[PDB]
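Practice problem. Given the sequence and the SMILES for chloride ion, write out the predicted structure.
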Amino acid sequence: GNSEEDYPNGTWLGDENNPEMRVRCAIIPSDMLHISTNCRTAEKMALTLLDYLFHREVQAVSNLSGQGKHGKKQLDPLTIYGIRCHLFYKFGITESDWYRIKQSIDSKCRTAWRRKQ
Ligand SMILES: [Br-]
Ligand SMILES: [Cl-]
Ligand SMILES: [Cl-]
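Answer key:
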């Protein structure tokens, strides 16, 4: 989401006060606060956000780059940037951290695909 109207009942990933580090999403306010306090590492928060933001059927046919053996859709890039910003504001992730978090997201998408077979 670039705007509040995209998800009127949702939340901002990142910080609403920063136009360059915010992405509107479908997660409701109380659920976002639950994720904040229950997901105690950046990796756990990333993977939990992924399950709130992308249906498992979408995860099964997607990955970050949109590449695979018979094609994969890219996970929505603006939403992924929103995850990055959200993790930065909560945990202070570095570039190295983010690369690894991306590896964990891609592994989760591969697991979603395997579970369907
Ligand atoms: Br990004
Ligand atoms: Cl809150
Ligand atoms: Cl778990």
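Check your answer against the key. The two ends are 32 Å apart (CA to CA).
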